[PDB]
Scaffold this active site. Structure first.
Site, short mmCIF file in Angstrom:
data_model
loop_
_atom_site.label_atom_id
_atom_site.label_comp_id
_atom_site.label_asym_id
_atom_site.label_seq_id
_atom_site.Cartn_x
_atom_site.Cartn_y
_atom_site.Cartn_z
N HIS A 112 0.80 -1.22 0.00
CA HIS A 112 0.00 0.00 0.00
C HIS A 112 0.85 1.30 0.00
O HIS A 112 0.27 2.38 -0.08
CB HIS A 112 -1.06 0.02 1.11
CG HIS A 112 -0.55 0.14 2.51
ND1 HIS A 112 -0.14 1.36 3.04
CD2 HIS A 112 -0.51 -0.79 3.50
CE1 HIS A 112 0.18 1.11 4.31
NE2 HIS A 112 -0.02 -0.17 4.62
N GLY A 168 2.34 6.02 10.05
CA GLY A 168 3.75 5.98 9.70
C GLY A 168 4.46 4.74 10.20
O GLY A 168 5.59 4.45 9.79
N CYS A 188 3.59 1.72 9.55
CA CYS A 188 3.46 0.63 8.57
C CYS A 188 4.81 0.16 8.09
O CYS A 188 5.70 0.99 7.90
CB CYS A 188 2.58 1.07 7.41
SG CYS A 188 0.95 1.67 7.93
C1 LIG Z 1 1.03 3.47 7.95
C2 LIG Z 1 -0.28 4.09 8.42
C3 LIG Z 1 -1.50 3.39 7.84
O1 LIG Z 1 -1.61 3.22 6.63
N1 LIG Z 1 -2.46 2.87 8.72
C4 LIG Z 1 -3.73 2.40 8.31
O2 LIG Z 1 -4.37 1.66 9.05
C5 LIG Z 1 -4.30 2.88 6.98
C6 LIG Z 1 -5.33 4.00 7.23
C7 LIG Z 1 -6.45 3.94 6.21
O3 LIG Z 1 -7.03 2.63 6.15
C8 LIG Z 1 -6.13 1.66 5.78
C9 LIG Z 1 -6.65 0.61 5.02
C10 LIG Z 1 -5.81 -0.41 4.63
C11 LIG Z 1 -4.47 -0.36 4.97
CL1 LIG Z 1 -3.44 -1.71 4.57
C12 LIG Z 1 -3.94 0.69 5.69
C13 LIG Z 1 -4.79 1.72 6.13
C14 LIG Z 1 -2.12 2.77 10.12
C15 LIG Z 1 -1.45 1.65 10.62
N2 LIG Z 1 -1.21 1.44 11.92
C16 LIG Z 1 -1.67 2.34 12.79
C17 LIG Z 1 -2.38 3.51 12.43
C18 LIG Z 1 -2.83 4.46 13.37
C19 LIG Z 1 -3.45 5.60 12.96
C20 LIG Z 1 -3.66 5.85 11.61
C21 LIG Z 1 -3.25 4.96 10.67
C22 LIG Z 1 -2.60 3.75 11.04
#
Ligand SMILES: *CCC(=O)N(C(=O)[C@@H]1CCOc2ccc(Cl)cc21)c1cncc2ccccc12
Ligand SMILES: *CCC(=O)N(C(=O)[C@@H]1CCOc2ccc(Cl)cc21)c1cncc2ccccc12
Ligand SMILES: [Ca+2]
Ligand SMILES: [Cl-]
Ligand SMILES: [Cl-]
Ligand SMILES: [Cl-]
Ligand SMILES: [Cl-]
Ligand SMILES: [Cl-]
Lengths: 301, 305
Positions: A41, A143, A145
């Site tokens: 992603h 961030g 991820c």
């Molecule tokens: C690296 C940040 C990130 O992408 N996070 C997510 O969960 C994304 C936000 C939008 O929805 C989404 C759908 C699919 C995927 Cl694979 C990723 C996302 C994220 C990861 N860990 C913790 C987080 C905390 C707060 C905001 C976003 C987070």
């Protein structure tokens, strides 16, 4: 003496954390040999996340669209391919800090350490368990991820998790290092929800044995139970069923303390029934389920 | 989201862990520049520990009596001296992995990461706090002596603890990196006991702010208290006094969540006189006191090293 939730020393993993950038998206990557692994992603915009076609988005990318940064050195990307939900960026330099490693897919109840990173920089390390619903109760911000989960059982780092997303309840979802998700999750912004989270019964039993090894015996009782009667009770408290495999796994601890697994199962049944009545077990007022039978033998013995 | 007990990345400290042997005794050493630091009781036999005269035991040892091992390379000891309860072994090689470091003595309530080692090999990392009674509730087995406690400030490792011993109740005692014990302990096989411990109040308040940041708000109430009324109640429940310094340190968290520090104290006051009533805060049925206000800000803002 003492029983602590302990993470593995993160040094071998810190030497692998790099920053990966694709357009405006920036996350973490795992640099092993001449390959950087990161969530696929990273190639998406927020407006692509509902229904991304990763094959289509990736085919439109060139090597110069990926900025890999290891400390203050920019790494040259000489190739890019996708394996399930992980992007693999081939780089011109093999990581000199590459430890002895392997990729392992773990099962629910298994524990691992997480090195939470932001912009390719490690910020902290904590111990986790894969929940029976395939989520991890992590501590992750935007961030994070690409942050990885691992075990370091003698010299070899076993990478078992890569962080991809946070579910609406605050829990986390990710993949093994081959890009296969743990659980029924997908890397898209579609409505997704974790299954009902249950307690890892074998781990609570292991932690009750760790308590007996450290001197705690107040919760022991003169009862035994059948495996079937235990499961009927445990399921009413949202505890995972205890299988015969779990009973065999607890054998060494059962032999060391002299308490049969089904006898300890009756203590667990009683604790669920009465609560702790102001007492603690290993400094905890709740039943701990993020210590496996293996962690108990490793830490105590 | 999520709140975990998190330790600093241990990499900078792992590159410093060496094995120190003196006769039959083997423990861990911290190799920084051309000096290896370790507990001075490495020179003691089990009988010497009863009433040791460390100057007398040390004057009898030569450099070759100390076997320092960094991985699979034996380090040659070219000098030995003692500073308080720490033995300093001068070696012929400066550690190429020496990070930017300083030695700091911490105050009770302050937290740090511990890299538990056995035979100079790191086995695990955990977070802990210096209890107000100067003990640490660690996880240490025989051979863990010389394991260190540290914090990281950007790229600088602040070494604050060296493990020396376990008290009969299972808690641990050690020194700063200048060999001065934390607490009224001595490095001798003799009857020693930790004083009655207290709860680190400012840390519980910080963890309540962390729960609020994570969406756990059930314990919040409309009330506030005076700093003096709060302390009279805290003293009763073996909670450390909250000073005006602690109130100022919780300011950023108070501003971020919109809950004044004395507003959060009335929640804490209620939690002591009433309990949690079957509820949990951040998955815990007890009030956590091993997260400082800085740890909460660091974790909830994503500070890296
Ligand atoms: C690296 C940040 C990130 O992408 N996070 C997510 O969960 C994304 C936000 C939008 O929805 C989404 C759908 C699919 C995927 Cl694979 C990723 C996302 C994220 C990861 N860990 C913790 C987080 C905390 C707060 C905001 C976003 C987070
Ligand atoms: C590194 C082992 C060790 O020396 N430990 C001790 O606590 C010593 C045991 C004998 O009595 C004693 C008195 C004073 C001092 Cl300074 C040290 C000791 C040790 C340290 N941490 C944990 C331990 C667990 C079990 C056995 C020994 C431990
Ligand atoms: Ca070394
Ligand atoms: Cl897929
Ligand atoms: Cl149910
Ligand atoms: Cl608890
Ligand atoms: Cl529980
Ligand atoms: Cl005190």
């Amino acid at each position: 003496s003492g029983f602590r939730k302990m993470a593995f020393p993160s040094g071998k993993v810190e030497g692998c954390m790099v920053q990966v950038t694709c357009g405006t998206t920036t996350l973490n990557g795992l640099w092993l040999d001449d390959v950087v692994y990161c969530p696929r992603h990273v190639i998406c915009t927020s407006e692509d996340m509902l229904n991304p076609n990763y094959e289509d988005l990736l085919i439109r990318k060139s090597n110069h669209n990926f900025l890999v940064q290891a400390g203050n050195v920019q790494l040259r990307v000489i190739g890019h391919s996708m394996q399930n939900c992980v992007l693999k960026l081939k780089v011109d330099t093999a990581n000199p800090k590459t430890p002895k490693y392997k990729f392992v897919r773990i099962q629910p109840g298994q524990t691992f350490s997480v090195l939470a990173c932001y912009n390719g920089s490690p910020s902290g390390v904590y111990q986790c368990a894969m929940r029976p619903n395939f989520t991890i109760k992590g501590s992750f911000l935007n961030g994070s991820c690409g942050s990885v989960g691992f075990n370091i059982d003698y010299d070899c780092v076993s990478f078992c998790y890569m962080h991809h997303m946070e579910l609406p309840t605050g829990v986390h979802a990710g993949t093994d290092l081959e890009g296969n998700f743990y659980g029924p999750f997908v890397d898209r912004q579609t409505a997704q929800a974790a299954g009902t989270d249950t307690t890892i019964t074998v781990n609570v039993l292991a932690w009750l044995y760790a308590a007996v090894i450290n001197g705690d015996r107040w919760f022991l009782n003169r009862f035994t139970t059948t495996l079937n009667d235990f499961n009927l009770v445990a399921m009413k408290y949202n505890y995972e069923p205890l299988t015969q495999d779990h009973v065999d796994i607890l054998g060494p601890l059962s032999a060391q303390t002299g308490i049969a697994v089904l006898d300890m199962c009756a203590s667990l049944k009683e604790l669920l029934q009465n609560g702790m009545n102001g007492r603690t077990i290993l400094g905890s007022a709740l039943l701990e389920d993020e210590f496996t039978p293996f962690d108990v033998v490793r830490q105590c013995s």
